[PDB]
């Protein structure tokens, strides 16, 4: 029904793999938000089957490895490292807290639902979200539950609801209702709510994937294509645009970089629904979340290719095939290093 | 065959003195008609 074009690209000087190693079998055909994390020059990664490793970030050598399985563990949600502890979610409604130095189990708690979300840590609390539309905050110390907020869950999507983004004592959250809200983190008290999605035949339209917080303004988009800038402390709208995109977007340089639901790449301004440029040649070729690495825009897709794009005008910088299995997860970059985990269970340093 | 034109005639029953017959149902009652029209093969039953 659709074809995927393969543009001709005049490649950058030397695209190359720095190292690679396998980590179990891989996510395979399961959709998830599981991705590696870098901390203290150690790359933390896991296989869905339950094998969790810490690798040496410079050459792929193993440093530490455990298995959390006894059914399989069914681990998901992504590796979060707080410096003190490593937090991992699951589809068995379990939350694991492992030590960062030597990863034995520090604690595990039941959270009443699949943790198809990235855990985050702020102000001494571990903020998680589950598939029942439940926002829950755990005690960082021992895994105790501190509070919950219960939102409705329409029979719509499998999109993971984003991790809460906390600023000034309260976090922005949202869910597959087409609504976003701000909740006070000290008590779990709801501060304000607003609806972003607008639909007619709404029963066939998914609502919401990831809020981005800047000083005084919160940016968020809905599945149905509503891109909105809101007042940080209220439901007051700063501006809206209608544009279709699901995946995590980059806000920086007073620029917004989006990946459209048609796999278009777009650069917008921050003061309105104003387009600066688009790269349409990737249309309908499934794209993953973008990152900015060494000043270049780095994207990839399910074919197994990575692409480098000129951050100022959309011009292609490079195209390279790395792994024939494809990339179904979020690419990451930190501390000058660009890391990616393939659909199959191999972690690469590029 | 025009069997309906060879049907036996109908005739009602009477009660002996002192007896009453069951109450007659009002269903399947045939009104008295003039009988002036044609019947059977003598009647043109084609559309008008």
């Amino acid at each position: 029904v659709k074809m995927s074009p393969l543009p001709t690209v005049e490649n950058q000087f030397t695209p190359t793999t720095a190292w690679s190693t396998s980590v179990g079998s891989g996510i395979g055909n399961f959709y998830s938000n599981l991705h590696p994390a870098l901390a203290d020059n150690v790359v933390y990664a896991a296989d869905r089957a339950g094998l969790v490793k810490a690798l040496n970030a410079d050459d792929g050598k193993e440093i530490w490895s455990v298995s959390l399985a006894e059914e399989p563990a069914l681990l998901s949600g992504g590796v979060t490292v707080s410096g003190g502890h490593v937090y991992i979610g699951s589809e068995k409604a379990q939350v694991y807290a492992l030590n960062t130095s030597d990863g034995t189990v520090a604690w595990q708690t039941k959270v009443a639902g699949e943790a198809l979300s990235r855990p985050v840590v702020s102000d001494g609390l571990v903020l998680i979200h589950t598939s029942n539309g439940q926002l829950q905050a755990l005690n960082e110390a021992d895994g105790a539950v501190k509070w919950t907020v219960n939102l409705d869950m329409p029979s719509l999507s499998l999109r993971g609801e984003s991790a809460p983004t906390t600023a000034f004592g309260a976090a922005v959250v949202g869910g597959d209702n087409g609504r976003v809200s701000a909740v006070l983190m000290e008590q779990g008290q709801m501060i304000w709510q607003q609806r972003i999605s607008q639909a007619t035949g709404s029963t066939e339209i998914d609502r919401l994937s990831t809020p981005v917080v800047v000083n005084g303004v919160v940016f968020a988009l809905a599945y149905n294509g509503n891109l909105t800038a809101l007042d940080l402390r209220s439901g007051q709208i700063m501006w809206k645009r209608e544009l279709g995109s699901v995946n995590d977007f980059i806000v920086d340089g007073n620029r917004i970089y989006l990946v459209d639901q048609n796999d278009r790449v777009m650069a917008l301004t921050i003061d309105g629904g104003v387009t600066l440029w688009t790269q349409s040649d990737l249309l309908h070729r499934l794209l993953t979340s973008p990152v900015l690495y060494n000043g270049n825009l780095v994207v990839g897709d399910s074919e197994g290719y990575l692409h480098w794009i000129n951050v100022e005008d959309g011009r292609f910088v490079a195209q390279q095939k790395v792994d024939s299995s494809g990339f179904q997860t979020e690419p990451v970059a930190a501390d000058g290093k660009l890391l990616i985990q393939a659909k199959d269970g191999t972690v690469y340093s590029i | 065959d025009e069997a309906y034109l060879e049907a036996a005639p109908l005739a009602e029953l009477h009660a002996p003195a002192g007896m009453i017959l069951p109450v007659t149902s009002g269903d399947y009652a045939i009104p008295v008609t003039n009988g002036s029209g044609a019947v059977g093969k003598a009647l043109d039953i084609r559309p008008p």
């Binding site: - | 034109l5 009602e12 029953l13 002996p16 017959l21 007659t24 399947y28 009988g35 559309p47």
Partner: protein, 213 residues
């Protein structure tokens, strides 16, 4: 206009194959539901379907015509043809050939025919079809009474003497003037004698004698 189609249908109705009359009528119904002859075509289809022993379609056409023309100068023609349709559905060629008495078969069609003819006679007392409907009602009424008679005989043979009494009493209420009632009366006398209910047996003997000859 398609004058050759109406004219051909009429010629095929006068003589020829009934399928050719139907073909010509369909050449109008499928294409000219609004024309000056649409109602005549529908009436011709009803007639042609009856004549060719195609009955489920004559009935469908009857219901269409009546729903389309609740009031019509010749609506009683259609009611009459409906009664003929239900009468026609009573017989069978194989049962007829060997001289089989079909009166003990399913009677539901006979009652439907009866109801439609009764409605015709009462609704249009001055219809030219009254005499024929009257003779049919007499015939059909007797045909219906025979069914109850045959059931009564079966039960008399088994010995369900209560069923025999209620079956005949029902005959007495609904068909006082038919032959089957006079033939049935001794069956009630017997039912009232196999059971020790002598007052009723004597009452039946008296009503039998009063009307005997």
């Amino acid at each position: 206009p398609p004058n050759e189609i109406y004219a051909t249908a009429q010629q095929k109705l006068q003589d020829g194959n009934w399928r050719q009359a139907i073909t010509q009528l369909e050449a109008l119904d499928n294409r000219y539901p609004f024309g000056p002859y649409s109602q005549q075509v529908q009436l011709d289809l009803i007639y042609a379907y009856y004549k060719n022993a195609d009955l489920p379609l004559a009935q469908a056409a009857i219901d269409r015509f009546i729903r389309l023309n609740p009031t019509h100068p010749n609506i009683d023609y259609v009611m009459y043809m409906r009664g003929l349709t239900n009468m026609a559905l009573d017989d069978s060629a194989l049962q007829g050939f060997f001289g089989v008495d079909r009166s003990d078969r399913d009677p539901q069609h006979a009652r439907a025919a009866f109801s439609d003819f009764s409605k015709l006679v009462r609704g249009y007392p001055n219809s030219q079809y009254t005499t024929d409907a009257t003779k049919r009602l007499v015939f059909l009424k007797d045909r219906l009474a025979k069914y109850e008679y045959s059931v009564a005989e079966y039960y008399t043979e088994r010995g369900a003497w209560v069923a025999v009494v209620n079956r005949v009493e029902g005959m007495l209420r609904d068909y006082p003037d038919t032959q089957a009632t006079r033939d049935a009366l001794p069956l009630m006398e017997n039912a009232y004698r196999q059971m020790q209910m002598n007052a009723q047996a004597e009452k039946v003997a008296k009503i039998i004698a009063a009307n005997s000859s």
